[PDB]
């Protein structure tokens, strides 16, 4: 049944995996520094390796200036053998969470942990490594997806994606937090490979501060951005301003409607267009 | 102060294994607890009966020569409750999805739910599309499941973002071709829902689309808004912003701007004459 | 390798036991147990683990509180275990907090909820009603979700999908039912006003426009802003269920302004209806 560690003076009771390089050399980048793992029973044996596991791995060859390490969790899909086990959860040394379900990456890329390393293993990728350390990366064939499942019970189904702007920083000892600043933005939009590389988003919805905030003024706008055919510049086209004006984001430039997609009728209180 | 270390001094790996069988040396079972690691904390003179925080390995499918199926969950216990009401709030499915199921969200009878497939099974009136399994992150919370993106300025700019990353090709094979964003690339943000029989497709959305295949000096996009009419179950594009920035209706002679009791106040345009 | 076995096909589990000082009850955020790689420098191991799973107490333990939570620690390439990062926190309430390098000081290593973050950083004041709602990502400046969507043989179709229903999975009954009216899916921005975070002040929302049934599932899409000098987020412009693009109030919101005019308007009727 059970197997314990105890610490009766109320110190902590911890388990450690120790591991070296070949010939007492320093441990290596992506070397498996330790692991915990179910092996299940086939009938008369156990599986050769674990079918579900927590792995600790090195990030960089270890040294006096690098104790780099990262984590991953491995699962095995119903109806496959541990040959096709999947390191689906990767907690990068930088702290990003990569989520890589079955189908998404070949097991030769099992040790990919960052955009930097993905760029290395797949030289045609070329995604912006400045995006490393920014949080959650999901990789799935075709249709990577977030599902927000929202039973009413007794109130309201209100799933939400909520950006939270503030001034200041939680990274230092000071820990000033302060009022939302101008040029605060919340972009939802699409980057993509142009055949050379990924770069900046080229179509977006953005929610922006339109102003610095204080406790009785919190202006926002909502802006829609596209990129023109033959361009690589994402441009604001239409926004809703803080006063609720729907507008083009530049004067004398963008139509409403076109010849083969005309508005059916316009309702405005003033019957005269103001030019 | 009291450490317990496995060591491998030739620089092999040093791993820990949980071994587990079925009854009477039978093959291990679906959702059978194949192993576990777990804090038990001290009440005053005893430990809790089970762990209050734990990593569990579980079987997915009865084990066999063609099924080594396994999955993971992490259990926590909320402040002010006993381990009776401990919560398997992190579930890493055998398909590789992450399910995130906080306190309040699922009854503990559904502690072993690991996919839309199994959720449909346990809750027969659910009927959600199991084709969505394997797609990444599922969050389940009563009423208000939520992603919070907390964005301190420090010295630059509060710029939280949700960023789709379109490409051609695949990371799943050995070739590993990656290539230019294709046409009919999309990034949909929208709402599915139960119709009283089932969940199905989204019925209102914002989408960012490729409007074109891409290359390094042309990366066209559009943004499109979709709704479903009362009495219909068809989600339809209504208004978009095109790659040239035209705000338009997504069909000719069909959608109004304004209505009788919600009129625009004034229109500003350079041409004072509507083109018909 | 080091294996525990259970040959009668009971379960084979590993337990960390831990007490308070002098056989006292274990404490809030006390490290109740752990598993941790220590790697080899050349002639020694690192002093603590460079990657680890920690179990911690939530609340002083008691007959009515067995509170516990989990975190995973990593160490970034080119730094020592001094600057290791508890980047994954699974709160006692069940939320997942994701806190990469650069995001929080190590003094806030034990932060596990908005409640406890408010405590450690008294100027924060974020709404603790948001605890238990799922995923919180904290990064300096640019917290981000990336959805990476290789075509292979079909279509690049990344998606963020709200799933409305009636009923509840929390009880034993487990009624699930049709999407109700005032169902919403908001994507938008809260922020500090200099006192506190509160509700979102600009948003896109997808709404139910109606209760649903198996032949009618109406939606609208609505854009909300807040005016300069206000703290009220207000619907401004929506796309209705019939596809009408409208202002969300009569005689109130312009299309265009004097220094940002539409270039041309195309409509079938050449006469504005007033």
Author numbering:
A (entry chain B): 989 to 1263
B (entry chain C): 988 to 1263
C (entry chain A): 990 to 1263
The authors write:
The well-studied Siphovirus T5 has a three-fold symmetric tail-tube, to the end of which three long, L-shaped fibres are attached. These fibres are made up of a homotrimer of protein pb1 (pb stands for “protein band”). The L-shaped tail fibres are responsible for the initial recognition of certain Escherichia coli (E. coli) host strains, binding to the O8- or O9-type O-antigen of the bacterial lipopolysaccharide (LPS).
A dataset to 2.5 Å resolution of the seleno-methionine derivative of pb1(970–1263) collected at the selenium peak was used as input for the phasing procedure. Fifteen selenium atoms were located as expected; the asymmetric unit of the crystal contains one trimer, and each pb1(970–1263) monomer has five methionine residues. After solvent flattening, an initial model was produced by automatic tracing, which was improved manually. When the monomers in the pb1(970–1263) structure are superposed, they align with a root mean square difference (r.m.s.d.) of only 0.3 Å over 269 Cα-atoms; even loop residues superpose very well. In the mature, chaperone-free structure, the third interdigitated region does not contain any regular beta-structure, although there are many inter-chain main-chain hydrogen bonds. In the mature fibre, we do not observe density for the catalytic Ser1264, suggesting that this residue is removed with the intramolecular chaperone domain upon maturation of the fibre. More than 90% inhibition was measured when T5oad was incubated with pb1(970–1263) at concentrations ranging from 0.015 to 1.5 μM of the trimeric proteins, while pb1(970–1396) does not significantly inhibit T5oad adsorption at the same concentrations. These data indicate that the pb1(970–1263) domain likely binds to the O-antigen receptor. An attractive hypothesis would be a receptor-binding site in the groove that becomes exposed upon intra-molecular chaperone cleavage, and this is consistent with the results of the phage infection inhibition assays by competition with pb1(970–1263) but not by the chaperone-containing pb1(970–1396).
